[PDB]
Amino acid sequence: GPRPTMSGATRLVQKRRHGFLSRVKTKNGQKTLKRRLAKGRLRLSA
Amino acid sequence: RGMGFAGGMKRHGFAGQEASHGNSLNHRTIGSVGGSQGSGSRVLPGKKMPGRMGAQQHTVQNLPILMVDNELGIVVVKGAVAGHKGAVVKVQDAVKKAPPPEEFVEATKQ
Amino acid sequence: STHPTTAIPKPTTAVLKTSPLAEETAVELKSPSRLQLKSEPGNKGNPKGHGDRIWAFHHIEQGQVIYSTKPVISHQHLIRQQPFTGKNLVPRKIRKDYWRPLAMIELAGKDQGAVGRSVYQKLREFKKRHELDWANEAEEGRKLMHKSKRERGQELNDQKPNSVADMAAVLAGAGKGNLMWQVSRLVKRQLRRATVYWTNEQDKFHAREWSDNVSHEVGIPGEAEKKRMPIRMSS
Amino acid sequence: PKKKTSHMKKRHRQMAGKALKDVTHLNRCPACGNLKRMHHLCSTCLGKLKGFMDRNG
């Protein structure tokens, strides 16, 4: 069953894993942004 | 004496079940209420189940008369009698015993 | 066990009527104390200069007052002078950008520090009796008893107006056995000269009447160096 | 439940002998004459008298 995995979760780690700079500065991250941008997303990261 | 809604132990003398050897929520319950399909697929009439107990007539037979007082108006009988204090009771000669002597029956009528 | 007093008329030892409930004035309820009948009570067992001046700081936003013998305040003052008036109403520390000097009391006697430590006592005892035993404001004035526990605790924090009236009372002889008196016992008694330095001229008007032995000056020493100009009514 | 309950058998359980009983134990207040409950005090007179004994007395 599901677990409470977001307990004690900090917003500093949200920006280091799923932030914007963690994608534009990487090879695989540019695909995510280019994929989410072609779909029309407003929230490209975090 | 009225006993209200009685269970299986106080009404029919059921033995009950275990107290601690794994028993689960069934300590004063009645258990099974009959047999499976081969016995009618139904609870048979006359099955002993919980219900209201007491407040019924009860006859106590063969109770000797120990004392008789006309002034106090009492008739002391041996043993116990059904009901509470202040309740009316019916007292009559025993049916399983020979009637009183013929002289007594006449003397009282006289 | 605590004993609260009722808002009933009573006699005052001061020369003026501190409150409308004051029936009499300048009433002697006890013989002159040891130092009361002394022309020059000196700083016997205290540092040099201690007691010559008394400072008063207040919260410019909420009105919480703190009395101090030194020109500054510390964390001890806030803990030992601020009672619990409710949640989120007693600050965890002193914020420099909120606490400013309210007034400063200076005595004529440059070496009679004992007269200052007595004024500082009656001031702290009157404050304690304002945060507790405030029967004079329950049904009149601010009507603290007709308010909520949240709004009530905020009016108990505003001790600035009460403090100014305590100075006019304490400096006018209020308090049993305060050394602001001077009994000759040749028996004639009088009050001692004092001066009050105000950062805001308007603050000295919280007291309905001031004694005759007090002189009012604008600006507290050391305030100008902080680029804090005093407030003057006449301008 | 093995089968859905019909409209007939549910209307029986819902309204057979479970009709709201009418309050027939009512009389008039001796002071004001308003309809009150038997053996109970008048609410209109109770409040007024309870408030009249608070001003003067």
Add this chain to the structure above:
Amino acid sequence: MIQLKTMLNCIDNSGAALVECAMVVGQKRHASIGDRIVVVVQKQRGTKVKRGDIRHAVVVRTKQKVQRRDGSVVRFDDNACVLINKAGDPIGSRINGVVGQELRKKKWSKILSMAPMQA
């Protein structure tokens, strides 16, 4: 009220000091003063009965209260008995201690013949 696994004090010179009840003879309700019981010797005293022997006994006094016809109730501090044979006669020759007075009505005259004090 002597029942299964009840420890009694044998008060005769038969050789037993502590016996364990194993069966109530002639009834289902627990044994009272003057009832037969099959016991098992658990201790001896210093043709005597040895530890582990099975004999019949008679309850002479119990710790449970015993109502009497005249309303007088008796109560002893311990449960005691005296061994007997299947025929019904005592094995020992001398009883040491007070015995219950209910033995007279339950046909135990022989046990009372050597009973020093009856209560």
Add this chain to the structure above:
Amino acid sequence: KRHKYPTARVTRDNSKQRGESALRKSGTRWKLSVSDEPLPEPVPR
């Protein structure tokens, strides 16, 4: 003080502010020197 050693008989109330509240107007615990006088009433802001 007669006996000064740290084990001397303790007869004081170590709970100084016992039963003292400002919101419930409990009053002062002990009778102070300014407790027999009326509280000075200031002029409101």
Add this chain to the structure above:
Amino acid sequence: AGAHVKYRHLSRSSAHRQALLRNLVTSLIKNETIHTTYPKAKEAQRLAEKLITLSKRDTETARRSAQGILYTPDQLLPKLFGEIRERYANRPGGYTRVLRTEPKDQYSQAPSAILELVDGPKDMRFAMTAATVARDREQKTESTDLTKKNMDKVTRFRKDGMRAFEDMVASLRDMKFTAGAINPKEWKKLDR
């Protein structure tokens, strides 16, 4: 299966049920009247009459037992052994009165009542009977047999007696308390 209850338990614990009655009798002597539920009024009625009985005794054991029923003895003891003791000096029992009323709380619709002290300043039956006689005299009607019975009940043991009753009636007429009252001769012709 066991014995019948000796009294009402009021869905409370032993300690909670005792303090409830001590509070209802403490507020009864302080206010002379309390408006509560009928079951609570009937349970405190037996403790309120057993407290006034202790006030009419002379031993100290009665003064200590009364100190254990009230929750502010220092404040309420002088009144119990004072005014109240003198009020019920000649009344042999029956010092309380429970009158049923409409639900105090319309949410639960729980039956309520008024537990009061007879011959007291806040006697409700003494005022309700005074309003009846005030309406009768103001409408030229004759008091019923029940009104005459209630008039003597509320004036037999009272100190002033009828004098205090006539003053209540006179104060209710000068106030026009019976203004808008329906005459008893028009109740049979009313459907609302």
Add this chain to the structure above:
RNA sequence: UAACAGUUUUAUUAACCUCUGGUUUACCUGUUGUUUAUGUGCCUU
């Protein structure tokens, strides 16, 4: 004649609290720790 003394067991069903016991959560008594209120409370001239 009087007086005195003696005149089954077990099992089961039900009723009943006189007796022997069990229970007692608003009864009485004793008692420990701590708290609250009231009253009272040391020596000396």
Add this chain to the structure above:
RNA sequence: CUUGGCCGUUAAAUGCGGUCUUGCAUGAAUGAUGUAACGAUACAACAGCUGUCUCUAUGAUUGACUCAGUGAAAUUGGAA
């Protein structure tokens, strides 16, 4: 095969402990074997202890029950 024979433990031992062992199908670092110490491991016995039981009874609280307010779920081809 089997509750193997014998001895002790139990009034009664398919159990446990010791011993005899011709071991369907023990065995030596897939380690063999005997102690101290340790174990919320598993089995067996003793003393004490108790409502576990003989045999249940009474009492307390919260539910259950009734009134007022709010208001579900699995389920259901149709049902006299």
Add this chain to the structure above:
RNA sequence: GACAUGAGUAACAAAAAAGAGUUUAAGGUACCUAAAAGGUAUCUUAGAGUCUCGCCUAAAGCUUAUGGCUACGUCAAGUAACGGCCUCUAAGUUUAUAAUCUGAAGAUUAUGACGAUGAGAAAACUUUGGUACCAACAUUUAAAAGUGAAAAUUGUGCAGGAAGGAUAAACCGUACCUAGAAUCUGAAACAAGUAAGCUAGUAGAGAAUACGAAGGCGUGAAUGAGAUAACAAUCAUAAAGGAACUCGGCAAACUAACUACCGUAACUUAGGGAUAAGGAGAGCUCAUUAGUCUCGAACGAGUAAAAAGGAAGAAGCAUGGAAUAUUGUUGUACGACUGUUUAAUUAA
């Protein structure tokens, strides 16, 4: 997708708990009064508060974090009484540079940059390597005494315990919530879970146990009032017997902590076993006093001083008086041991 059935049923039971007055605003009724108004009483919705009672309390309290679908008038040059930004670097990171390796993507080493969970001048005015180091543990030290931190001093064991830099006041944070009573995570107003400091006092070796000063609380009708059947849960007591229950003493009960108390077997790797087993004592009152302390004047007096103290005494059924610490012993199998394991059916 709408609407039925179950059903106006279950549920609104963390074993804290409520009772009686007062009162504001808006509105709905009845009466007084017919000039509208206003007054008296009452009900509804959204509040506030007084007295009494109870619960939490090394919390269900206060001050602040992580965090936030709670709300936006939250105010600082720095220290006392503040963090960030900024400077330095750790583990590591790098679409930076150079070299090298590599089907492309990339990878590698060096350097640079970046990166806190760490280190950063002064202030109640201020701007070399034991000549050591600031890991663990122990000890000593702001001089009236005692306690707890800071830092330092000295020593001990082996498991041998960072790096780098130094040395006239901008910008951002500041509200509220801390989970038993309206805010975090658990799908939610969930009996769960989450960091730091403080956390009255009495009494104790103690943060154990009991009481509980202040404070908060006794939920948004997400409930309230009654009655006190069966049965269920959670508990209390019990005649005689004391495992006869049962797969099995499951559960429950007995036992229990304390003393500078007495005593303690087989066996043993010589350490143990052992707090073995088994006994003794305890509260109140008091004779007595070597020193310490106090009062008066060596001596005398005093426990309205700490202690010591005895074969002293009193009362009761009972003085480990209430609460807290869950029996003892014996024979085997397996595994030496302390530990670890299927998060949420197997802890061996």
Add this chain to the structure above:
RNA sequence: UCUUACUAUAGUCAGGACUAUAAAGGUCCGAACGGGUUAUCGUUGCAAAGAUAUCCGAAGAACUAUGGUAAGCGAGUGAA
């Protein structure tokens, strides 16, 4: 951001007892804390792993916090 292991910087473990040490012990009793032994309850639960009691460790192979690293052709981590 759960979890396993590693890693960097930090933090916590009332009181008492035995032992050769004032400090040298995967020592002992027992809170915090960390585990989850047995039992009951709950099972459309307060809870898609909870409540109560009982039990185990509690100076160590301990526990905890903020970061970092290693996982999905080969298998990351694993007192398995």
